[PDB]
UniProtKB/Swiss-Prot annotation:
Family, similarity comment: Belongs to the protein kinase superfamily. CAMK Ser/Thr protein kinase family. CHEK2 subfamily.
Function: Controls S-phase checkpoint as well as G1 and G2 DNA damage checkpoints. Phosphorylates proteins on serine, threonine, and tyrosine. Prevents entry into anaphase and mitotic exit after DNA damage via regulation of the Polo kinase CDC5. Seems to be involved in the phosphorylation of RPH1.
Note: Present with 6900 molecules/cell in log phase SD medium.
Protein name: Serine/threonine-protein kinase RAD53
Full-protein residues shown: 549 to 730 of 821
Primary residence: nucleus
Originating organism: Saccharomyces cerevisiae (strain ATCC 204508 / S288c) (Baker's yeast)
MF terms (GO), sorted A to Z: ATP binding; DNA replication origin binding; protein kinase activity; protein serine kinase activity; protein serine/threonine kinase activity; protein serine/threonine/tyrosine kinase activity; protein tyrosine kinase activity
GO biological process terms, semicolon-separated: deoxyribonucleoside triphosphate biosynthetic process; DNA damage checkpoint signaling; DNA repair; DNA replication initiation; meiotic recombination checkpoint signaling; negative regulation of DNA damage checkpoint; protein localization; regulation of DNA repair
Length: 182
């Protein structure tokens, strides 16, 4: 209980939160945690792989990294079905969904160790510290930390199942003829 019962708004204690004042994870998959080394500092939340989740100096992106070096829609993250490797394989992965970091601005964004060169795409993983921007010449880096908290049906449960087999992939499908408009 908490209130006399039915008055401010209605029903059981805190209405047992049917619509729920609380929520957390109602459609969240990744929490972008920018660190202090990055001009940004806190934690963002990409909803269940918004697909796509742009990010840059233009709020038009699914997020906002307020960083001048960003050319508006500076970087462009995407999300889609894992899609098993083309050929061979034994147990595919129908369903699930992989993420795709893809820089599209005029500059370059990256993923821990893979430097993208605009209009480029790349795969993302859990705890994948990314860097929307990186200009050591004038002390300006956007250190970020991809933190997958859901991983419900996320293929590979988000955990970079590898040691060294994921390099930046140039654009594709014209930013899927959808991210190409930014």
């Amino acid at each position: 209980e908490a209130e006399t019962r039915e008055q401010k708004l209605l029903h059981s204690n805190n209405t047992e939160n049917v619509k729920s004042s609380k929520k957390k994870g109602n459609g969240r998959f990744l929490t972008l945690k920018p660190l202090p080394d990055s001009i940004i500092q806190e934690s963002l939340e990409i909803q269940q792989g918004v697909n796509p989740f742009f990010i840059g100096r233009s709020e038009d992106c699914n997020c906002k990294i307020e960083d001048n070096r960003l050319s508006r829609v500076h970087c462009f993250i995407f999300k889609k079905r894992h899609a098993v490797g083309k050929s061979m394989y034994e147990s595919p992965a129908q369903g699930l969904d992989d993420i795709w970091y893809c820089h599209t601005g005029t500059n370059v964004s990256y993923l821990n160790n893979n430097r993208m060169i605009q209009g480029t795409k790349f795969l993302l993983q859990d705890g994948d510290e990314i860097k929307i921007i990186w200009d050591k010449n004038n002390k300006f880096v956007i250190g970020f930390k991809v933190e997958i908290n859901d991983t419900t049906g996320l293929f590979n449960e988000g955990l970079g199942m590898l040691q060294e087999q994921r390099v930046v992939l140039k654009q594709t499908a014209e930013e899927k003829d959808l991210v190409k408009k930014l």
